[PDB]
Amino acid sequence: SLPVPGPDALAQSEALAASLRAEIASAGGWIPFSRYMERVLYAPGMGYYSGGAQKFGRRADDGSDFVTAPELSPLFAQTLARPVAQALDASGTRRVMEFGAGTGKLAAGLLTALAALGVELDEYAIVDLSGELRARQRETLGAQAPGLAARVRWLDALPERFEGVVVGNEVLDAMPVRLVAKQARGWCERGVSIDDAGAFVFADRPFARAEEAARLAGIDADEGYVTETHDAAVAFVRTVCAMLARGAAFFIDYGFPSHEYYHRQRAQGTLMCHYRHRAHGDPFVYPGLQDITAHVEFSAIHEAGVGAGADLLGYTSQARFLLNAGITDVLAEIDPSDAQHFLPAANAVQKLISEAEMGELFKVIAFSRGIDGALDAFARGDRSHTL
Numbered sequence: 001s002l003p004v005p006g007p008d009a010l011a012q013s014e015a016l017a018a019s020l021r022a023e024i025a026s027a028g029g030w031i032p033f034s035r036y037m038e039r040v041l042y043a044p045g046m047g048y049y050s051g052g053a054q055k056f057g058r059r060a061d062d063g064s065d066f067v068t069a070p071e072l073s074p075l076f077a078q079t080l081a082r083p084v085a086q087a088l089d090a091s092g093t094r095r096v097m098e099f100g101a102g103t104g105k106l107a108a109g110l111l112t113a114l115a116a117l118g119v120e121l122d123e124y125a126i127v128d129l130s131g132e133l134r135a136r137q138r139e140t141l142g143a144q145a146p147g148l149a150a151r152v153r154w155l156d157a158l159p160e161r162f163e164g165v166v167v168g169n170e171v172l173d174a175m176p177v178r179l180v181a182k183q184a185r186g187w188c189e190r191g192v193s194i195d196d197a198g199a200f201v202f203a204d205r206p207f208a209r210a211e212e213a214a215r216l217a218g219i220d221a222d223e224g225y226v227t228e229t230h231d232a233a234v235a236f237v238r239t240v241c242a243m244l245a246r247g248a249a250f251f252i253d254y255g256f257p258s259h260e261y262y263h264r265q266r267a268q269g270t271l272m273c274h275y276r277h278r279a280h281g282d283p284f285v286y287p288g289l290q291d292i293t294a295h296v297e298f299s300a301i302h303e304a305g306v307g308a309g310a311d312l313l314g315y316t317s318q319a320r321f322l323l324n325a326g327i328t329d330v331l332a333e334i335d336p337s338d339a340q341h342f343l344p345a346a347n348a349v350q351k352l353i354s355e356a357e358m359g360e361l362f363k364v365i366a367f368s369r370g371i372d373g374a375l376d377a378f379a380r381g382d383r384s385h386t387l
């Protein structure tokens with residue numbers, strides 16, 4: 001069912017795989033799933049995300065693996081600019097920092113939409129783990145925001161403090177997770193080993209310490225339940241919120257609060273892989289050539305940000321956030337008689353806000369420091385009390 005990679009791509013994946021087999025052997029034959037993801041997704045040079053921009057796009061026939069809101073439509077960035085601007089104003093700051101900037105479309109769109117709102121930034125900082133997307137980002141910015149691109153900086157390291165607005169779209173979902181599985185007796189960790197034939201397989205091990213099972217005790221799990229823990233995303237949000245001195249941080253991503261994430265019925269968890277616009281469950285397929293994600297558990301994200309000293313600014317579905325922020329007014333700026341522009345825009349809005357598409361599954365959580373009031377983008381249907 002999955003497309004076969006070309007022979008040159010298979011050679012890269014094979015080299016990654018062979019090194020990882022050797023690593024698992026040297027480790028004693030078992031590694032946590034988080035280390036497996038760390039390698040296949042983020043190995044320097046060889047990881048899926050240590051690579052260029054082809055993976056981002058709209059359709060299989062452009063060579064991409066998955067679509068994201070910035071790739072889908074400029075109306076996403078144009079809408080997001082409204083709460084970003086309000087947060088800059090409320091906090092008295094003048095910089096934006098984006099993590100995981102992809103092709104640069106979100107940055108170019110935010111810059112041009114912020115300018116149209118009368119907001120000039122001192123800096124738009126792009127934070128990626130390595131530098132392989134810098135050339136495509138520069139190209140996008142030159143093509144789509146030519147008179148504003150000069151304000152962009154690609155950081156090699158985070159500042160100790162930051163005053164401004166942080167953005168990350170589909171960044172939290174991409175972070176390594178550990179897998180846990182319910183036994184007859186308590187819970188264990190599901191990791192990765194290598195079978196007799198040299199294939200990657202799941203394999204279970206006990207936890208080293210009892211705190212580890214006790215944090216899962218509240219899950220109403222039957223034997224066989226398997227789900228994900230999200231320490232990496234928690235650590236990242238703490239880093240962001242400890243760095244933030246004044247301003248806000250917005251994370252847009254698919255997921256749920258804890259009571260929904262770890263619901264009795266969600267017994268297979270949320271782990272999914274994306275390859276050439278096919279979603280499937282096998283993270284051992286073509287290592288380095290496909291993504292592996294889990295949904296975001298927003299209660300733990302909330303606790304992470306607030307625990308590092310930030311305030312919760314809001315939490316709601318992407319539909320409510322974008323509607324509150326003015327996406328319907330953004331669409332109304334386009335003349336309905338201009339069919340070439342209007343129909344694709346209306347279609348993308350539908351995808352961004354419909355519960356059958358992105359609108360309910362995707363959520364937006366925000367943190368702040370030095371913001372006393374509420375953002376308009378959270379003024380209706382905020383779900384903070386459910387976290």
Ligand SMILES: Nc1ncnc2c1ncn2[C@@H]1O[C@H](CSCC[C@H](N)C(=O)O)[C@@H](O)[C@H]1O
Pocket residue numbers: 049056068069070071099100101102103127128129168169170171174175236
């Ligand atoms: N700790 C971290 N800091 C910066 N980027 C990270 C990160 N962890 C993961 N990422 C990056 O986040 C990206 C997720 S893919 C989504 C890309 C883009 N925001 C879009 O919507 O189109 C990847 O490029 C991955 O390398």
